[PDB]
Amino acid sequence: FSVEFKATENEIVSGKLDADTPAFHLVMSDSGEHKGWNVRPTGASEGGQMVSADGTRVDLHTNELSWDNDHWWIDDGSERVEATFFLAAGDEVKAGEYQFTGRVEEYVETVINSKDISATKTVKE
Amino acid sequence: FSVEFKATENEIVSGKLDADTPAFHLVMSDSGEHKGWNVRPTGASEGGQMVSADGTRVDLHTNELSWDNDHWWIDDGSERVEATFFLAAGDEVKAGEYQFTGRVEEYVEDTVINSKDISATKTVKE
Numbered sequence: 532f533s534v535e536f537k538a539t540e541n542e543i544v545s546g547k548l549d550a551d552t553p554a555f556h557l558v559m560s561d562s563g564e565h566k567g568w569n570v571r572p573t574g575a576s577e578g579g580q581m582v583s584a585d586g587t588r589v590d591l592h593t594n595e596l597s598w599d600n601d602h603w604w605i606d607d608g609s610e611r612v613e614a615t616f617f618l619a620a621g622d623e624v625k626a627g628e629y630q631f632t633g634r635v636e637e638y639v640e641t642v643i644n645s646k647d648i649s650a651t652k653t654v655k656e
Numbered sequence: 657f658s659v660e661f662k663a664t665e666n667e668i669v670s671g672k673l674d675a676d677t678p679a680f681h682l683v684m685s686d687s688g689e690h691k692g693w694n695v696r697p698t699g700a701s702e703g704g705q706m707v708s709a710d711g712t713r714v715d716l717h718t719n720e721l722s723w724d725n726d727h728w729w730i731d732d733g734s735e736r737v738e739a740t741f742f743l744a745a746g747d748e749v750k751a752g753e754y755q756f757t758g759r760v761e762e763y764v765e766d767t768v769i770n771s772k773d774i775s776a777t778k779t780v781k782e
Contacts, residue, residue: 562703562713608672608748611712 532561534635536648539615545655547623554581554591554652555616559635561644567606569636570596570614573647576632577601581652583627591616591631624654657686659760661774664740670781672748679706679716679754679778680741686762690769692731694761695721695739698773701756702726706778708752716741716756753777 539553559568575582578601581589595614596603605612616631618624630651637644660683668677684693700707703726707713720739721728730737741756743749755777762770 560711562705562715609712609750610714611710611750613710 532563532637532644532646534559534646534648536635536650538650538652543618543624543652543654545625548618548620550620551592552618552620553615554618554629555631555650557614557616557635557648558611559614559637560611561637562610564639565608565637565643566639567604567608567637568596568612569638569642570603570633570648571636572602572631572633574632576630579603581629581631583625583629583654585626587625587627587629589618589622589624589629592619593617626655628653657688657762657770657772659684659772659774661760661776663776663778668743668749668778668780670750673743673745675745676717677743677745678740679743680756680776682739682741682760682774683736684739684760684762685736686770687735689764690733690762691765692729692733692763693737694727694729694759694763694768695774696727696759696761698757698759701758704728706754706756708750708754710751712750712752712754714743714747714749714754717744718742749780751781753779 535558593614593616596605632649636642664678705713718739721730757775761768
């Protein structure tokens with residue numbers, strides 16, 4: 532069971548976004564049998580947001596995972612799932628170094644593996 | 657001593673597999689006297705997997721060979737051994753062109769007397 536979570540490489544500059552814009556990339560993997568995965572935001576990211584030092588909160592979205600109130604999930608039995616988290620078109624994005632913290636879970640049927648993820652994405656000038 | 661190793665002809669689509677589904681075919685030949693063979697996965701395939709570009713792994717299986725921790729093997733002294741490697745019924749298969757790499761070894765009782773790398777790629781899907 533392996534999890535990789537990191538900022539995307541594309542630069543984001545302060546302002547109001549024309550389009551959906553990548554901010555994080557996630558990969559969840561396990562050769563062992565499973566039903567799927569959860570990505571649960573933790574601490575300040577609760578709500579599914581990325582957060583700067585000055586407390587500015589920005590929503591994350593992904594087209595590779597589903598959402599259920601406060602977390603992402605997906606039923607996927609394959610060995611490996613990839614996901615991009617993007618910021619939505621229109622969103623104003625302001626000052627700083629924005630951190631996402633969460634916890635990945637692997638489940639069956641019941642959680643059988645889990646690991647914290649954290650990464651920080653930069654915005655601006 | 658010859659080895660033939662290649663992707664099967666049957667088309668695979670991504671999704672949950674409804675049956676044991678062929679992926680590769682292996683032929684190991686020697687009319688010379690020998691005890692058996694090993695088929696040892698190499699590189700990314702170690703563990704017994706075919707591995708796609710993005711690193712996704714699918715387990716390979718065969719009913720024609722035995723297994724010893726990390727490799728297949730068979731005592732078979734005949735001139736020719738065939739084997740087919742299949743994906744297990746129910747496995748959800750996804751994204752890519754999946755390669756298997758390994759090494760074949762022919763052994764005798766007394767001990768390896770011939771060896772050769774094998775490599776092939778199987779396409780999945782859509």
